[PDB]
Amino acid sequence: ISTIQPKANFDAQQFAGTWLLVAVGSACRFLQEQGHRAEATTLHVAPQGTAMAVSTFRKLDGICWQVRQLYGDTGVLGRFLLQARDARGAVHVVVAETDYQSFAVLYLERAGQLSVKLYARSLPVSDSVLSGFEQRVQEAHLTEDQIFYFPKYGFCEAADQFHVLDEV
């Protein structure tokens, strides 16, 4: 657990747009307890000044849901604060690495509870990148046994008006 350095000169306007979650690792029990059937997840990243509006598009029982969230700018480039709406706590999100047309490795912590995610722009992902992610997970001190790859297909976009959390 540390504030590792973000992506060197992170650029929301390059990181903007579609990103595909490749895998997550965390202790968070629900990743394993009912960890089955984890739906494919895709992000649209939209610059909102220094912050970004991020919409996670996901299935839930085949109901396509979009979650509107602000990665609020901390003022450190590539470090963000997700405000808590009386949620369990704000999430500090460090974009630790990315190639804006290829991959991103996002570090997220709430209340000292940390998680790491691999996102990609493409269905195929260089095993090089994935291995690197694994490395940063070991450096994260998370076991490989906590890595949860997400199903390759069944992404959803443009959730219904009624299937939007509008969390902001």
Binding site: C28, F30, R58, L60, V67
Partner: protein, 49 residues
């Protein structure tokens, strides 16, 4: 994780309420009635000598 927050699963019932039965019902009723009538007459007499 996408989940349902347990908060507000129950409410404390005030003493004066004997019951407060949560019970989701809906009933819809529609009626629609269209009555349109049109009548035309012509009557022509010529009488020439």
């Amino acid at each position: 994780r996408l989940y349902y927050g347990d908060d507000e699963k129950y409410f404390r019932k005030p003493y004066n309420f004997l019951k407060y039965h949560f019970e989701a019902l809906a009933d819809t009723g529609i009626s629609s009635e269209f009555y349109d009538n049109a009548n035309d007459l012509l009557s022509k007499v010529k009488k020439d000598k």
